[PDB]
Subunit: 333 residues, 4 copies
């Protein structure tokens, strides 16, 4: 049986995670749900944003599904950032962001791409300094870090029909850092002769993501950079509110919607569970239930096509109604 850790986090996670739980149950798969907690509200009760319990539960599971956490933007409290200590322990280095066409308003057709960028947390914190009226932030590339992220993007590419990887870099103006990243990924690419590997100045890649996004399969890039490309990509998909994501290490993985905790519409029951269910689909794929993951995705596509609509999609139906619609559409497939 597959052990799945569920952590709702904050705000709209209390709605989207149970929603995803039900869709997962509707696949019929041998699933065991282990519940844990984390986030802002967790910190208010435990003195820590990630209790030891949560960390143990994650490690005893094949995969983890996470909602969203409330990020304090008004301030920074007395080390609520105990999540950074967890990020090191887990070392989920591969950030994975699919951008795929959906049947929604303002969505480009024929798009099916995946952007991969590293999380450095498991290796190092890139540090900022400020000395008087001058501030410097380090952008750090290591060979080790570039080897494993490259290899992870290549695995992603290899298990996709088109077997294409673009390395999006800035080695034209950053020959030491971006050049080290370019070169290293190209070295590991030799270990994947079945994958067609191309390199591209990230500036050209941004333009082509707007003009012809259907040309890309998998894109590998460095951090600050993947995000910007992913954000542009999400622009073609009708926003960040439908976007799934995963963070993947060598032993385990956390999957989570890209949206925030959205305390504005929290506890109202209208938040769109799409991005969470799609994250759970990503999770099934990662686990090996590829056909089962495909079935969940169609079940979601059918409901974006055959109703109902939540307030973000231009309607006023509820979170709960959307879920059971997806659940029953999955029974069909």
């Amino acid at each position: 049986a597959y052990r799945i850790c569920l952590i709702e986090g904050d705000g709209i996670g209390y709605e989207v995670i149970p929603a995803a739980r039900r869709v997962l149950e509707a696949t019929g798969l041998p699933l065991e749900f282990v519940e844990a907690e984390a986030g802002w509200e967790t910190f208010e009760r435990r003195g820590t944003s990630v209790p030891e319990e949560t960390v143990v539960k994650i490690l005893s599971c094949h995969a983890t599904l996470f909602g969203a956490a409330t990020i304090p933007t008004r301030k920074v409290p007395g080390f609520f950032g105990a999540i950074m200590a967890l990020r090191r322990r887990l070392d989920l280095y591969a950030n994975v962001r699919p951008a795929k066409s959906r049947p929604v308003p303002g969505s480009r057709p024929g798009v099916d791409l995946v952007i991969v960028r590293e999380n450095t947390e498991g290796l190092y914190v890139e540090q900022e300094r400020r000395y008087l009226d001058v501030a410097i932030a380090d952008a750090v590339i290591s060979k080790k870090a570039s080897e494993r992220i490259g290899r992870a993007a290549l695995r992603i590419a290899e298990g996709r029909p088109r077997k294409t990887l673009h390395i999006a870099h800035k080695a034209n103006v950053l020959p030491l850092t971006q050049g080290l990243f370019l070169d290293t990924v190209k070295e590991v690419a030799k270990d994947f002769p079945l994958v067609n590997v191309q390199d591209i100045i990230v500036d050209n890649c941004a333009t082509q993501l707007v003009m012809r996004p259907e040309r890309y399969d998998v894109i590998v890039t460095t951090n600050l950079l993947g995000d910007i490309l992913s954000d542009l990509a999400a622009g073609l998909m009708g926003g960040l509110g439908l976007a799934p994501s995963g963070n993947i290490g060598d032993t385990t993985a956390v999957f989570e919607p890209v949206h925030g905790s959205a305390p504005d519409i929290a506890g109202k029951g209208i938040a769109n569970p799409t991005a969470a269910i799609l994250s759970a689909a990503m999770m099934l794929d990662y686990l090996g239930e590829k056909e089962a993951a495909k079935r969940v995705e169609k079940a979601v596509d059918l409901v974006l096509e055959r109703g109902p609509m939540t307030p973000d999609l231009g309607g006023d139906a509820t979170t709960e109604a959307f879920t059971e619609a997806v659940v029953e559409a999955l029974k069909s497939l």
Copy 2:
């Protein structure tokens, strides 16, 4: 009379700059053109890409109109660090990149924006290090640099109908560097009470530029971020073929098309002069000749709408036929 330094550069420069010159002359304005040489083809003839005569000429003129330089395929022979010394000495710290809808195919309607970010060379080279298998590139923000680039963007914004500036930043994750940039631009923004100033996370800015580019007018951001935002914006325009640009300092400015020297078509008389002409228009605006500048833009738009159409626009017309049509259209605008 205005002194204008004309530098053709390489490749199609010899075709598009004279075209721009002719459009400028068609306005009737008192313009003294001072010819100078620079670029790859100049290096081959002289042993330097920017001869001393050319530096003296640039400094003796109100503005400089430049074509394009051919970048050598491999190693910097060579080389040209004469271009790098020029950059330092001139301190043209304000990179200005308009993105405006044109009546051509693949150009998204309703876009009218300017992206502003700094060229650092006049202040400092942002340094890279490699220590064994760890490479680090410095990203530098200073108060002095942020002050002037903010002020320059605000002056651009103020001279425009919408009176709107957005500051695109990463202060949410880089609070020391990006926060210094953010805080400083907002301080100088107090000197511009007529300008509506909003701030936005660069990531959200990118999504919005794809979905709703019409809400933006002037965007000020840091370097590397701006470039990707210009690339996206160029994606909306259907590419870089028509884009004008400027680099402005405290005493002069160099205007040039974004496009390269396109050497494989040089001499063929099919290069599209739009971007050089629109850069001459930016120049006119800069010199305080706003009405003539708008007249020039109008002449270009009319010809883009109703032919002649050069090969890049899907037709078979020549550079010359296009230039003569712009010249003729101008007189009636």
Copy 3:
């Protein structure tokens, strides 16, 4: 009347500070002593090493005389970053470390110098990073920091008979950082035409301090360099037992012996108060009581020459007998 904040600190502090107090009182000067607590033993009692009452008291006084703090054997429990916040808030940027021949054994004759270097905390924490197996510590020089430390050293030098300052630097191998320090101190040196200012490579300075320490008066240098130069100089004096020190900012100063709390001998009445008394003398000088300060130094020298001799000086006399002899000697000087 002068307000003097008295902080005993840990260990022998409770013995050497009262001794200094008695010597000060023996001058007859109008001195108001305000007792405050700080250090390890204070942390055990209060949960903080520097209580708020103590900060208020330090700020309400012209100067502060401090004993010594016990440093915890291992981990910073704990901890005391209340000392680190104090450092930041007070900005006592001028570390002052006199090294003068005493009539004791192992003290090299003919030495009379002061080493000055900056405490950075009031301006910035100089940061360390580790990225995998590569560690980097920043060594920071700024013009603002170099200006004030140079000016402070020059004021020390000016108030002394020889009117001599040497700037000890590494500009031969670190021309950007050390060169900025060198160039800046020399600029401010133009404000002090009465002071003879020479520059010297720190390496040559060290050799000379060993061979010919008598040619130096005031030495200004950067942090980490100064410390090693003080260590060498302490070697000439036969150790740290007799050394006074000061940390001076723009509005106040803290004076203290270089030595530690020596907790294993606390309460035994054999601690030598020389360094606390000589720090009180530095304080008197600082407050504008130069003649009384010299009287105090003279009283100390006489007693060092003709007994009583505490165990550190090779005798069996008590703290008390030594203190009473200094008090008595003072009246006749």
Copy 4:
């Protein structure tokens, strides 16, 4: 036969190297001298400070003896620093500086120590940056670099009678950089159970080098730091003018006096060859001719004791007379 490369360099090297050549010849050992050139004057003739010839010659030799190079202090010419390209090729990471008692004025007796610090050139250049009014210089420690330098100091220690190594560090205030150095050397020390290994805060080590230098055998430290300790040590020995040094890699070694080219007294024939002959002695030791190296050292000691004296030692005899005195004293032993 032992192949010895001789490079006189600049100035007083033309006098001290031939002097050392003769002493080496006077040992009777199977020696082959291969002559090469390098330095300031070499650069004036070849356009390069280290010709390819020189590099080839060094590599074909067991060891190299070098005079001194003239360092331009008035300026920096068009990359005279081609010596830095050689420093990388050779990777002579272990800087070795003996400080041993000699029969000369102002020389402490009973001193026989060796200070070891790394040259980083073969691995990386520690970079400086200056951004506006702020300058930062990197102090870089790597594990790899600390392993090999530690191991080299340990080998030095193991082949000396007392088998003692002190690690002089600043890990009390630099826990990431200096702590990494401390820890790593201590790990490799486990591979040398016959060596007694002690650690010491470099500040304490400086004081004890003045007070009791005879307590140290081998000291290992980081750069900037060894030099300062070595300079203090040389202060006990009557200056830097008698000091030998070597730079040692895994395949070869360069030995050289610590003094400069001294163009002041160049071509006059009075410069003291001691430091060069002692460097050649170091070289014989490194090569395996330990007894032969011992004989050269006594031969030198006998002449510092039984005349004659050069202008630096308080006399007016010549370089040439000093040499033949040493040569004949070696015939005795």
